[PDB]
Design a binder for these strands. Sequence first.
RNA 1: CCCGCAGAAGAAGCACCGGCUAACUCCGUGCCAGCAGCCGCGGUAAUACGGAGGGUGCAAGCGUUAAUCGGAAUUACUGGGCGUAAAGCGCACGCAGGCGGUUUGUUAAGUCAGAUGUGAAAUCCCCGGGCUCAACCUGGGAACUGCAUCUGAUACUGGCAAG
RNA 2: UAGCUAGUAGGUGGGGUAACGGCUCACCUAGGCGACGAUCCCUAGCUGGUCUGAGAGGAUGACCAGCCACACUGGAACUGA
Lengths: 150, 111, 123, 80, 205, 129, 82
Amino acid sequence: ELQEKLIAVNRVSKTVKGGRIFSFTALTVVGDGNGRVGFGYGKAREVPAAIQKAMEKARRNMINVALNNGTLQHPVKGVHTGSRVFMQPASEGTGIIAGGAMRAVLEVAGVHNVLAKAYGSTNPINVVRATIDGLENMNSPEMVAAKRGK
Amino acid sequence: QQKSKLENMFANMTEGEVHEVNIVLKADVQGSVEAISDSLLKLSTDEVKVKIIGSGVGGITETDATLAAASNAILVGFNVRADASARKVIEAESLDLRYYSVIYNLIDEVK
Amino acid sequence: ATVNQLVRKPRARKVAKSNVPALEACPQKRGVCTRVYTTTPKKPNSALRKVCRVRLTNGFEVTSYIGGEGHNLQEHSVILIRGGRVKDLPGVRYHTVRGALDCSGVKDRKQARSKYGVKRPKA
Amino acid sequence: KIRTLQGRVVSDKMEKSIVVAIERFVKHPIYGKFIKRTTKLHVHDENNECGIGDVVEIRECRPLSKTKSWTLVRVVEKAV
Amino acid sequence: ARYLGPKLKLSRREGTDLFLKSGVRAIDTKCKIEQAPGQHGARKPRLSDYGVQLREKQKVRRIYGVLERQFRNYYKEAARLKGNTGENLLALLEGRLDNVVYRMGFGATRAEARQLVSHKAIMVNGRVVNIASYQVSPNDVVSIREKAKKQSRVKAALELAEQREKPTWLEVDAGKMEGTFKRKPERSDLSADINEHLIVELYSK
Amino acid sequence: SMQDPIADMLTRIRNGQAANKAAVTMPSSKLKVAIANVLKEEGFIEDFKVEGDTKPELELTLKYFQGKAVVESIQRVSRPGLRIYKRKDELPKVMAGLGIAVVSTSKGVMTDRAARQAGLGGEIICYVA
Amino acid sequence: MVTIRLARHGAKKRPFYQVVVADSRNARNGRFIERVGFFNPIASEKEEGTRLDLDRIAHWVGQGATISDRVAALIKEVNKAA
RNA sequence: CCCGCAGAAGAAGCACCGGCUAACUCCGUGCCAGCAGCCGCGGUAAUACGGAGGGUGCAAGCGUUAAUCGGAAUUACUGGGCGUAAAGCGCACGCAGGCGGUUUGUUAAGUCAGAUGUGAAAUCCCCGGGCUCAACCUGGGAACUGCAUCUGAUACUGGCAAG
RNA sequence: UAGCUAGUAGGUGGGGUAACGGCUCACCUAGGCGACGAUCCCUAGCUGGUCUGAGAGGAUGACCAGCCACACUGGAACUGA
């Protein structure tokens, strides 16, 4: 049920007095298959060290996303840093058809149908979080019955 | 083609015969171009070397006039007439169009 | 930005000029290939490459790259030119076709026969 | 009565002729903006009737000159 | 428009039993399956995100024995058809004549089922059919003709066909050497290990 | 300017919802009141009110359920500089039908849901989410 | 001359004619006023294949249009009530 | 189209495998000879050249080239910017143009509803039919986002009148 | 390319066309078109559609069908519905 996966890994540099020392950072997103979306970045001097902290941080900071059946309740716009993310429900249509960075967050959230097409900046670390912000701000037709109806 | 070029076994000619003349020939009949060329290679000498380029089956054409445009040459035919598209090219750039009824008048002037 | 501005002057599009000055809606052309030169590569690399100034049938004189190891092309014998741009000797926007018209294909080549006009040997 | 347009006089005296400047509101195909378009049309006249500073009703007819294939009927008020 | 090469290389490169070596024996035992896909196949199984999308398409194509151009039409036909696009993909492939011949147990393998259909020995509703890609609809009855009946090729297939799953969506019969297509196969009755969402993805980009 | 006082009120809401202010005061009008009537009808604003004779002032009480605002977003679609008009089924639906648009039809100011049922549309005002 | 006539829009070695009211000066597959029906001369023994609307042609016959030997034959093949 | 005869007999190639991008080692060459779409490889361990073995994609086709769109939210109406990245006129007064507070009455142009005519057929789309399947062909339907006229609705915008 | 038009814009009368008309004449009047792009220059048959695109659009106008123009170049008439 853990359903965890990595998006991408990127080598970086420091350049201290002695010379260049290269660290590694692996982005990861996790989910239970029905809502409960979460993610983690982290860093380390090794590849297996950095991925471990990413999956470790992905356990905490997990929030529910509301879905109808196996689809979104409505289309929702979301932005983060310099990235701009749109999505459409498209009920049982073709499905989970999207490029890397945003592929992980949709499939692990539970959606096997919605279309992405992420505009603006397509940076792996900025394109993620635009989903979680765009899925957190999304509200549910059953639980908006507080404002709706009466 | 590979043999004749490699036959010299040197990057240039050993002496000053490098100066040569080029000719362009298109004859209406196929029988002549092979036959008279052999006689046209008989007049060849060590001093001045003459060679035929692009022997035609008949008439004249755009790519033939273009062939004489790249390398300076005389355009001659045993029997030929100028095409409508041929006249435009020959009249524009500086060239020479001469047709000869007999091979004897030709063999004399090339010399 | 404002709609009433764009009503007066609509949105402009760049013509996007082609990287093949031959044009004529032509995939391949031919040309006289007057002189075959040998020139050094760009800043990063170091080599000697076989390139020739090809006078096309349309009228435009343009330089063309000779692919493969060695060639019999020079002076006369009109060759076909496939086109396409690879950057190394400054000015080259085209490539010559091998195994077409009067041009010889690459000798003793086995892989990639489609490119460089190499025929299938009898096995 | 046959179909008509709400255009105005705009030219006073063309020596037994009269043009009609017709205003209209149309949605622009691409942007969806509503721009006022002006359709100037030549019209035939009778017994030197009222000119500029007026708005004149118009109707289709046989052409009595080059273009000039419309005829007038009624005019609103007198002064501009 | 056929493969003709080694059937187990297609099984090896996927790393899954395609049921192409079945015939008489079954369940492999001797194999060398996966482990050395190529000469340097003993290298680690780490592979790209794009490659696993293509790898699913190849599994479905290598099972049923379909070429990319012919298989392009089945996605295009499944997409325009209503409901789920993934469910329609395998439904149109499951309705092929070679496969319906294979499911009933006439051919011992899927290539052999296309083999027999090519020779004009299979007859739908009385009339003969050459083409293996013939689409079988509901209430269509398919059977072997009087010529080349009760042969050891077809007889041995129907003998060991009882040892397989025995599909519910069509009647095996095999009494008079005939068959019947009852209804369109369900999503639960096929697929399972082969995923339709992975193959359906590849065509979007 | 006062030029577009319809889109003023849409900005008055979003500023009031962001600022957590209860009571919002502004000028009144014919369409100005009828838009606010539709907001209470579906159940977004708490209540509308008007007070005055020579210069009536529109008082709109803003509703709050949680710490977050009730209305997610309200934006001017059709504006003085560019108008948008919708026939019968061209009338767009916001967020898969969740919430309502405001649309001025012949008989009166209605929603996108109510415009479909009656079988007549018109000038869209704004999308309530 | 207004004439009812059969234009071949089908396939090579498999004809499918289209009975249509047109001017005689126009081409076969060219210009026409309007279609009336269809006649496949291949087909098989089945419920459909030959269809023709006599209410439409009999109008054009009254207006002054002639009928070709085939269109006449197809009207006299199918008859009216039969 | 159908029946018979003989026998696996008569019938598979092409690109590519450094990352992008599915698919790797050895040998030879040693900034040489060459590759290349982009970033780049080769100056003596080249998975980037050439050959070989192996492999992948695709199939009577396979590549290259040329051509147009897509990607390109990079002309962005839908659907982008303008402090410091390409970009606010040096500033102002202003005609045409664009747009306009609030109330009532009116007009019904814009807008919205319904009807009628037309928007050829084919094509595309949907449900069927006939060529052994398919391409192809075909019945009907839908659609043709349109324009005009006529009869209505009057919230909004415009015209007009009094405020 | 910002000014462009003397049969040019309109009228009256006569002639003319199968038919309305500056269609073509005489006379009279000084207008006509144009920033909502006239005129000039460059390129091009147009449309149903084709291709691409989620759509909006973009590019395109082979074959199929509709309309138009042209028939070695230039100009004119006859016959005939």
